[PDB]
Design a binder for this molecule. Structure first.
Ligand code: HEM
Ligand SMILES: O=C(CCCCC1CCCCC1)N[C@@H](Cc1c[nH]c2ccccc12)C(=O)O
Length: 453
């Protein structure tokens, strides 16, 4: 038996299949054709793409597999360094930072961020309240304004002031370019070829821009009168219980970059996909809006009120089921092992978890997997182990999950309280890929229900 494998291109093997602006969606189509596992080869390189809960539950066994840095993350690492997202589990700075930063996502920490999330959310609601009758909303663009500003303010007491800008913040444009450069480094035979000299200068330029802003954040804090108690406070002061050490300056810098990027992009995607699915499913929108009106009785939502937005949470999880905005993660075999009783693996062999395919596993979810039905999440405990993995796995799972979900629930709740939404262009879903996923060109009209803040 040979493991299923998609079409090859001679000595380039499968590599040309990733020569596309939508590689994840291409891989999903391949997964549909070949099933729960396929081999993917390139010159000097191999991985295996997993799509079924049957195989992914084994892959999520931390005694057998550990987080691997995919080739994309290896290039992200050139500017994210040994930050949490791009560090190996066995690097000293992973476990230190993990221990040091987990308290920044405690219950008491989340209550502490609430007021500043509301600040940015109110700015969003006011922007939309202030639009003229003709005008429309550019959804992913405004969601990115919100999520970037929220992480900036909550995490670093720094105001990006994205709602004061027509263009995206220069950080965003550099970040997008740097992440695209990482996605396109995958294809290049002979990386040191003189033809790619300008891309390396452009890459060093974009990194410079992100790093310049990290300096501005550091200096703002250094010469600050106020006494914060946020993510940066913990990076600067906090001590790891195990080693007894704090993070050094080089690592703190990497953590800031990491949190700025990981701390907004996927969350903007989530809010965009959620609103997309709501406007395409009006009965679901109505149910979510009824909850928002019932629960959000005060002009400013409370922490407790956001926690009571059960259905809005269900809407968000269902959006994550269909379009998990960080759609893959990578694993390597810790020792020789046999996957599924059928596929033998040697130490160091790599796996890719194709999350959107896991989330369409019919043996877990039933036959209607393409339908947007938030009621699937009525009781989240009903979902089998390792069936729903939009925040990854185990000790290497998303540290910011609860942050992302609180922000998204708050903002979507406020959006549904304050506005009726019109899919005025009958938008055809078009998913842009930049490692992460977004509905490009998604636009709506928002008719104010006229409720004061
Ligand atoms: C919808 C929103 C989000 C999604 C879908 C998401 C998804 C993920 C996924 C899949 C991973 C695992 C990556 C891998 O195994 O290679 C991860 C890790 C991480 N996420 Fe998120 N994330 C989100 C929001 C956030 C936010 C808001 C923050 C920070 C404020 C954040 C910070 C991180 C960090 C630091 C890690 C690395 C954790 C570690 O390995 O120690 N994420 N996230
Ligand atoms: O799976 C891919 C291509 C899609 C990228 C998905 C993103 C990964 C980071 C988190 C968000 C989603 N690439 C893999 C595997 C791979 C298979 N053949 C290859 C040849 C050359 C380079 C990579 C590669 C990866 O990046 O390792």
């Amino acid at each position: 038996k040979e493991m299923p494998q998609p079409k090859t291109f001679g000595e380039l093997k499968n590599l040309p299949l990733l020569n596309t602006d939508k590689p994840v969606q291409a891989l999903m189509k391949i997964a549909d054709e070949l099933g729960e596992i396929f081999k993917f080869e390139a010159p000097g390189r191999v991985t295996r793409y997993l799509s079924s809960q049957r195989l992914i539950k084994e892959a999520c066994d931390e005694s057998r597999f550990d987080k691997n840095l995919s080739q994309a993350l290896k290039f992200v690492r050139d500017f994210a360094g040994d930050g949490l997202f791009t560090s190996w589990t066995h690097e000293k700075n992973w476990k230190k930072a993990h221990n040091i930063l987990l308290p920044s996502f405690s219950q008491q920490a989340m209550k502490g961020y609430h007021a500043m999330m509301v600040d940015i959310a109110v700015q969003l609601v006011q922007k939309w309240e202030r639009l003229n009758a003709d005008e429309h909303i550019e959804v992913p663009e405004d969601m990115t304004r919100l999520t970037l500003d929220t992480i900036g303010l909550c995490g670093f007491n720094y105001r990006f002031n994205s709602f004061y800008r027509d263009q995206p913040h220069p950080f965003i444009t550099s970040m997008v370019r740097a992440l695209d450069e990482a996605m396109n480094k995958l294809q290049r035979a002979n990386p040191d070829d003189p033809a790619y000299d300008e891309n390396k200068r452009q890459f060093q330029e974009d990194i410079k821009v992100m790093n310049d802003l990290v300096d501005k954040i550091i200096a703002d804090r250094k010469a600050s009168g106020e006494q914060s108690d946020d993510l940066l406070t913990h990076m600067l002061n906090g001590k790891d219980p195990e080693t007894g050490e704090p993070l050094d300056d080089e690592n703190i810098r990497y953590q800031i970059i990491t949190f700025l990027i990981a701390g907004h992009e996927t969350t903007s995607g989530l809010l965009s996909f959620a609103l997309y699915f709501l406007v395409k499913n009006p009965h679901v929108l109505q149910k979510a809006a009824e909850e928002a009106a019932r629960v959000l009785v005060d002009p400013v939502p409370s922490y407790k009120q956001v926690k009571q937005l059960k259905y809005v949470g269900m809407v968000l999880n269902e959006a994550l089921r269909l379009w998990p905005t960080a759609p893959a993660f990578s694993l390597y075999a810790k020792e020789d092992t046999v996957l599924g009783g059928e596929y033998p693996l040697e130490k160091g062999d790599e796996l890719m978890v194709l999350i959107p395919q896991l989330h369409r596993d019919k043996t877990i979810w039933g036959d209607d997997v393409e339908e947007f039905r938030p009621e699937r999440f009525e009781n989240p405990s009903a979902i089998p182990q390792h069936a729903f993995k939009p925040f990854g796995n185990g000790q290497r799972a998303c540290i910011g999950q609860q942050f992302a979900l609180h922000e998204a629930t708050l903002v979507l709740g406020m959006m549904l309280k304050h506005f009726d939404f019109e899919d005025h262009t009958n938008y055809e879903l078009d998913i842009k890929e930049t490692l992460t996923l977004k509905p490009e060109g998604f636009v709506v009209k928002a008719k104010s229900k006229k409720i004061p803040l």
